[PDB]
Design a protein around this ligand. Structure first.
Ligand code: CA
Ligand code: CL
Ligand code: MN
Ligand code: MN
Lengths: 371, 366
């Protein structure tokens, strides 16, 4: 069942969107709220099209309304971090992804980009590249997956993965609209597929260098939510939307450095993985917005997943925590895939943990300060 | 410029003859100094021959006069003068046609850049002011009068052609070349912005504006080209040497010899070579035509009135795009709405010249 807003005449809205807007420009400021997994937005009018992110003014909002502050000093600040073209309003309107700061200009608790950028600047010469496979499930407003029988289940899994046809793929209109919207916005979207669970989908973001991975994925998530809002359905990043023999949603992260991409870079890939072998618990905590409880429902070691309590790595191992692609093993260079991160992970937390363990050789149960 | 086309409207009995009585931009105002110089040297040489020179030296002097008269060639210099002056006149007219005029641009702007509000009016005025500014920049680069009117870019700013902010953008550009093209690039950017904002309604109108802008800018570039590329100096020196060589030959070879020697073709002495002075008028003035038109943006009386053209273009463009934008008298029927033929009356002064059979073709009188 789709939302009441989706039943409003879309024809009418278009007619208003066809009006020439004139000299004023709309900027939509996007930020992460106090849950560390929700996105918030609002719009301001600018006098002219900004040429770069530097021209965008800082803004503010009430943190007590976003689970981000309490009491008197609840005013929070928005500092623009990345700019994109607005696919919902078209050029010259912009999407402005912002960092959140408290009233005293300290980073907000869900502001993970502030530290993530400092870590990325530390290893800039090694040029870390990331890719994330964002899985998501389309849901009706009733909390049941989009397209599934009322209070019931479709046929067993098997035909839905990369499926085509009215009985195989549910809500491809949303997937096509999102893909185009991301390409128009300047998001580094690498592809899409239908997932094993019907009404479950995936888009790939990358390759992205350093802090660009978190910006591109967060804005790609925002566009998906905004596109799904137009169609009147919900995109969930819950790691296990439906209990039982229905696939979880993960965010598989591909990681490579300049050394790993160069000839005979497999030795550096293996060195990074054995470093990851010794910090499995540290990464599980970082790979989930609430410390790894959500990913416990997904990482059961059954549905092409690994076990949350046990670390494993191998070439072409779908069930392992870390997978080296078969081609990467043959070519002796390229990347490795971390399959642990949950679909509702913060990419700033995930990328920072990979750099700290693999590149800065950090150890122990707490992140190093100033290094 | 000296305009006399009213005087020569008809081929009258004294039409061109009375043009010799004019002074402003005339042959006399250009030549009288060289005329006095030539007469001074001729009279001094004649006086020296009559008095100072010995009787023995006078035979040598008169033989040298005959020798110099034999090589006085007036026909060949006419060819080099005709060809050189024709080239200079071609360049002069083409230079006039290259004046930055904004009439085409004002017509396109008033017909394509819309809005009765402050922003549409700002768009139209600024679009025409950019073309005016590029015209002012190229003209002050090429014309001495405009340069004395705008000795600095500060004078351009105080004149209202360029603003304070436009001045800062103008000076911050890193280029060692003349920046007369900058307001044209600003025009292109402003036209694109107007089209993006919906002030220009149709895609064709934007294309027409950029086509008319490139015509205006090419005229500015052509003025720069004519200013940079002179008539080749060697050819100017050739014509000057030919004319001056002929006149040096005429100064001595046409000297009045003593009739007592009885030399043929020299048995008279009028102490004034009036026919040589008429030939001086002819050839020296023919060279002076080129000497005045070679740079038509100077301060000669017949040079182009660049400041007047700047003032006219600015005032007319502002009027057309601001006060005349969408300001029309209501559509009404004319005097010939019901008339099969649309013909205006004639005054009493023109009827008796007119009312003649209309030309239909050469082959209809068979
Ligand atoms: Ca002149
Ligand atoms: Cl909004
Ligand atoms: Mn997948
Ligand atoms: Mn994968």
């Amino acid at each position: 069942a789709t939302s009441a807003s989706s039943h409003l005449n879309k024809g009418i809205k278009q007619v208003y969107m066809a009006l020439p807007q004139g000299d004023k420009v709309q900027a939509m400021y996007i930020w992460i709220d106090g849950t560390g997994e929700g996105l918030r937005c609002k719009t301001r009018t600018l006098d002219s099209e900004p040429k770069c992110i530097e021209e965008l003014p800082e803004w503010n909002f009430d943190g007590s309304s976003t689970f981000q502050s309490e009491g008197s000093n609840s005013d929070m600040y928005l500092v623009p971090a990345a700019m994109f073209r607005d696919p919902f309003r078209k050029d010259p309107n912009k999407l402005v992804f912002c960092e959140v700061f408290k009233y005293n200009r300290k980073p907000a608790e869900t502001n993970l980009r502030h530290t993530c950028k400092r870590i990325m600047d530390m290893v800039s010469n090694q040029r870390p590249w990331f890719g994330m496979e964002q899985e998501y499930t389309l849901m009706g407003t009733d909390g049941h997956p989009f397209g599934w029988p009322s209070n019931g289940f479709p046929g067993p899994q098997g035909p839905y993965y990369c499926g085509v046809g009215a009985d195989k793929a549910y809500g491809r209109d949303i997937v096509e609209a999102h893909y185009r919207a991301c390409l128009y916005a300047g998001i580094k979207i690498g592809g899409t597929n239908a997932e094993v669970m019907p009404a479950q989908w995936e888009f790939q973001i990358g390759p992205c260098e350093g802090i660009d991975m978190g910006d591109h994925l967060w804005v790609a998530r925002f566009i998906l939510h905004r596109v799904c809002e137009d169609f009147g359905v919900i995109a969930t990043f819950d790691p296990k939307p439906i209990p039982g023999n229905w696939n979880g949603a993960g965010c598989h992260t591909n990681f490579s450095t300049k050394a790993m991409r160069e000839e005979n870079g497999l030795k550096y890939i293996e060195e990074a993985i054995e470093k990851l072998s010794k910090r499995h618990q540290y990464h599980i905590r970082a790979y989930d917005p609430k410390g790894g409880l959500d990913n416990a429902r997904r990482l059961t070691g059954f549905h092409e997943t690994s076990n949350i309590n046990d670390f494993s790595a191998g070439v072409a191992n779908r069930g392992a925590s870390i997978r080296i692609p078969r081609t990467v093993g043959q070519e002796k260079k390229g990347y490795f895939e971390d399959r642990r991160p949950s679909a509702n992970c913060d990419p700033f937390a995930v990328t920072e943990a990979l750099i700290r363990t693999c590149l800065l050789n950090e150890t122990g149960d707490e992140p190093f300060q100033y290094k | 410029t000296v305009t006399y086309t009213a005087r020569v409207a008809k081929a009258r009995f004294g039409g061109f003859s009375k043009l010799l009585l004019l002074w402003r931009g005339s042959i006399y105002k250009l030549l009288w100094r060289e005329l006095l110089c030539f007469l001074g040297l001729f009279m001094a040489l004649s006086a020296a021959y009559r008095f100072v020179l010995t009787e023995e030296q006078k035979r040598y002097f008169e033989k040298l006069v005959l020798y110099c008269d034999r090589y006085a060639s007036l026909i060949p210099v006419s060819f080099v003068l005709g060809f050189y002056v024709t080239l200079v006149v071609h360049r002069w007219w083409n230079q006039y046609l290259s004046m930055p005029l904004t009439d085409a641009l004002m017509c396109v702007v008033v017909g394509t850049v819309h809005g009765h509000d402050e922003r549409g009016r700002l768009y139209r005025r600024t679009l025409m002011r950019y073309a005016g500014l590029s015209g002012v920049l190229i003209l002050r680069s090429v014309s001495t009068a405009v340069f004395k009117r705008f000795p600095t870019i500060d004078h351009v700013v105080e004149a209202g052609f360029m603003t304070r902010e436009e001045r800062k953008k103008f000076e911050n550009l890193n280029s060692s070349y003349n920046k007369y093209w900058v307001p044209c690039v600003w025009f292109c950017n402003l036209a694109a912005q107007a089209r993006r904002e919906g002030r220009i309604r149709d895609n064709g109108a934007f294309k027409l504006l950029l086509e008319e802008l490139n015509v205006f800018r090419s005229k500015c570039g052509m003025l720069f080209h004519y200013d940079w590329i002179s008539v080749p100096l060697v050819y100017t020196q050739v014509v000057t040497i030919a004319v001056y060589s002929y006149f040096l030959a005429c100064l001595i070879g046409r000297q009045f010899l003593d009739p007592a020697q009885g030399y043929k073709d020299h048995d008279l002495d009028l102490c004034v070579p009036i026919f040589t002075l008429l030939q001086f008028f002819f050839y020296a003035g023919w060279l002076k035509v080129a000497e005045q038109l070679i740079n038509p943006f100077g301060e000669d009386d017949d040079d182009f009135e660049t400041n007047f053209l700047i003032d006219r273009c600015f005032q007319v463009s502002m009027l057309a795009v601001d006060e005349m934008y969408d300001d029309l008298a209501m559509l009404e029927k004319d005097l010939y709405w019901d008339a099969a033929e649309a013909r205006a009356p004639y005054t009493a002064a023109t009827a008796f010249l007119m009312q003649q059979p209309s030309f239909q073709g050469s082959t209809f009188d068979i």
